[PDB]
Amino acid sequence: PGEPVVGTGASLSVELGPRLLTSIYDGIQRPLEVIREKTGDFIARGVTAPALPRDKKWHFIPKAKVGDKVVGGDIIGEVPETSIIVHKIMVPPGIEGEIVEIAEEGDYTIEEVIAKVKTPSGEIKELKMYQRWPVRVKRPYKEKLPPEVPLITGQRVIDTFFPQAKGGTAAIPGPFGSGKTVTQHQLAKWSDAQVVIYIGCGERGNEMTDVLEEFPKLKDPKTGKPLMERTVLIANTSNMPVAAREASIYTGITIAEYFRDMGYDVALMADSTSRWAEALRRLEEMPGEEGYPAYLASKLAEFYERAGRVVTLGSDYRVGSVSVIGAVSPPGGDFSEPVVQNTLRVVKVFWALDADLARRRHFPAINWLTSYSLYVDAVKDWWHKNIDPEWKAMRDKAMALLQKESELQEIVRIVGPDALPERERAILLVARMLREDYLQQDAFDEVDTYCPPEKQVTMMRVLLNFYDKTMEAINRGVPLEEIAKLPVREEIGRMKFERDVSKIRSLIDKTNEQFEELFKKYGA
């Protein structure tokens, strides 16, 4: 402990090595609960509790030989840490030279020196299975890559209309423990990140008890194994010092960056509740290294600035990412106050969970008019090249229809529906199908809980093709009443529950031909 200094010092750090996975920590990486700390533009203090166990024995597979040149981030061994995650043992940033000594394959505790590096000036550096890093300094990397690859969530509304990029920043309302919603949990378990760092914060009541003995019971749907085996929990209970809680997102993101550095995609999910900043009191009369108006607003930007997909340190070309999903729960839930405005200025994605959607049981209750993603153009080429060349045209078309529907519903609120032309009735019919057959998704269903990219575009094609055929039929004298009761419509309403994508795809031809029947019946 201690060893303290001037600046932003006291050396506030985290340990990084086998046994971060499955751990539950507080805001400064102690293995359970309660001790009181005090924060400042200067230092902070603690006392007793060991982050990574020194007694446990880890299997070390060497990945480098005596005589190898190494740089920061180079991978010198592998440690099978859970049944899901292989831990990658890396040279700490700043250390380079020749490997003069390295442990043979065997079992070792984390304090055992598993390698030695002779630096260029001849200093001999001793390497263990873990390393320490100041939580307040971003771990370094070679290059931060532009947003490009979507974080695939398997949730249609998000992946299609409001995509998250790997390395992106997203915000979502309210506490993660809210029982009104389940997308928080869908995101945690289905996103294609190998590792999840979860800061179960804003915890009061059952929030720290049911989060305790369900996560070990929780299953990783991709592997049957427990979700905890690829997760690190960081607790922010109400009985914790406001300084360890503050520091928790920094400890979390440092641990995220650490798994990023191995070549992993990692998702960092940060919880939040009500009224953190009444402890505020431009205006800074007595300042130091904390010029405190909305200085915190600039510091939040800085945290979110640590998200990204990067070419990592190391001598191999290696990419990893940290994508950030932050909860936003305003003081009164009025979404005008600081917490929301300060977050919404930095994040590139907002998923507007909407109490009115939930109340009418439209699930995922994501408002498709107030949500937005600034990654749509960033990710489109990945969809075009890998999944479907018409991904972006199709989403834009479906969105235009959602927007037309919304304009039409306003007008109909004023004058009612009796004067609606067939064409506008047809737009309402197909928008309703989009809403019900595509946006709505069943998280509780064994099929519809996850929707693969290939299934998403096929379902979209079935719907947009039905749109085209509807408008061309209207355009040919076929009454809307006849289209509304086309037998294929009910198969379209059920396609989300079909796991065979070729059967979903067959609905295109089946739509086409049923419409032909109408075209000939009405001699149209």
Ligand SMILES: Nc1ncnc2c1ncn2[C@@H]1O[C@H](COP(=O)(O)OP(=O)(O)NP(=O)(O)O)[C@@H](O)[C@@H]1O
């Ligand atoms: N089958 C399902 N598939 C996906 N999500 C579901 C499903 N069933 C329920 N949900 C979730 O239910 C949520 C409704 O949230 P909503 O109540 O609108 O949030 P809110 O009340 O505005 N604030 P909060 O609940 O505190 O975050 C949606 O985010 C999710 O869809």
